[PDB]
Design a protein around this ligand. Structure first.
Ligand SMILES: COC1=C(OC)C(=O)C(CC=C(C)C)=C(C)C1=O
Ligand SMILES: [Zn+2]
Lengths: 188, 134
């Protein structure tokens, strides 16, 4: 049928029970992926094809900048913890290269406040139980499906697409192709 | 013909494996790619092909072929991507290697305690594959 496994999605070896339906592991700094989410807004362009109403998820990774990597992970988790993930996402995403805030916790926090959110919320989340559970959940989530350190969106039990398997002749429509695989895996 | 590449392999094997020791580990992946390819092909050449300097003499062409193919593409890649940041591209570490094939990185790389220049050597060595044929 001209369509088969290998040049569409990578076949894992074991799924993760109880894991989110659609989860993306990305970094806040290091990958060229910066364009992936900042330019092609794939996580956003792709969410627009939500099939039947499947919920998406976003996770950060621990590599690079030892403490910084982990620190940004908490920050990301803190975002999910406040529920104000979308708003701070980009400002903080764009905050790395375009603002250069890669400093200490109190700094990384400062920009978080600047994202238009009140500190009273971030404070509790800095250590609260919810946040502790979330930071660990990342690593765990990634570890359950051995990442390595790359942007990849896995689907409920299903696997993530192969960016190098698809084509790169339509930077614009590319989202559609990127999005055609995800839709299929969701209910098929 | 064996000693011909062995001289550079002996020194290149070690030199390549030299300037990556106390200098401060500094591990990656793409790094291991050229290293496993660089060592694999240079070895496969002396270790075998580069030996019959008299018969069909053409077992090395296949070995050299792979050297650059990977070399050129391991040199002319991530590097260009670096000034032209692209979505599909990202960061990484170690990198898997099915079909058993012991350690591979868990040792060849970690077994120790600006690479931009490295790009030119492989790109150059590329033509060596053809001339050496005789
Ligand atoms: C891109 O990957 C590589 C490096 O980067 C960390 C190296 O330093 C080195 C070794 C560096 C010198 C100066 C011999 C190699 C061989 C390499 O493939
Ligand atoms: Zn834009």
């Amino acid at each position: 049928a001209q369509y088969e496994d290998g040049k569409q999605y990578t076949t894992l070896e074991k799924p993760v029970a109880g894991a989110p339906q659609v989860l993306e592991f990305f970094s806040f700094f290091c990958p060229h992926a910066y364009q992936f989410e900042e330019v092609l807004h794939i996580s956003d362009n792709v969410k627009k094809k939500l099939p039947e109403g499947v919920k998406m998820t976003k996770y950060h990774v621990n590599f690079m900048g030892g403490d910084l990597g982990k620190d940004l992970t908490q920050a990301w988790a803190v975002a999910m913890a406040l529920g104000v993930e979308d708003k701070v996402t980009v400002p903080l995403f764009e905050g790395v290269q375009k603002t250069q805030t890669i400093r200490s916790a109190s700094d990384i926090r400062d920009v978080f406040i600047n994202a238009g959110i009140k500190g009273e919320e971030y404070d509790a989340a800095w250590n609260s139980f919810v946040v502790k559970s979330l930071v660990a959940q990342q690593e765990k989530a990634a570890a359950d499906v051995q990442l390595r350190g790359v942007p990849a969106m896995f689907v409920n039990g299903k696997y993530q697409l192969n960016p190098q398997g698809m084509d790169t002749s339509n930077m614009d429509v590319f989202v559609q192709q990127y999005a055609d695989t995800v839709k299929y895996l969701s209910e098929k | 013909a064996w000693l011909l590449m062995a001289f550079t392999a002996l020194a290149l094997e070690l030199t390549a494996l030299w300037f990556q020791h106390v200098m401060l580990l500094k591990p990656c992946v793409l790094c291991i790619y050229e290293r496993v390819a660089l060592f694999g092909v240079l070895g496969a050449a002396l270790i075998g092909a580069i030996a019959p300097k008299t018969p069909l003499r053409y077992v090395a062409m296949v070995i050299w072929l792979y050297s650059a193919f990977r070399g050129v593409q391991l040199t002319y890649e991530h590097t260009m991507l670096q000034l032209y940041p692209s979505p599909f591209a990202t960061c990484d570490f170690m990198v898997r290697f099915p079909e058993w094939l012991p350690l591979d990185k868990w040792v060849p790389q970690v077994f120790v305690a600006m690479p931009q220049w490295l790009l030119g050597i492989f790109i150059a060595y590329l033509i060596v594959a053809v001339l050496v044929v005789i």
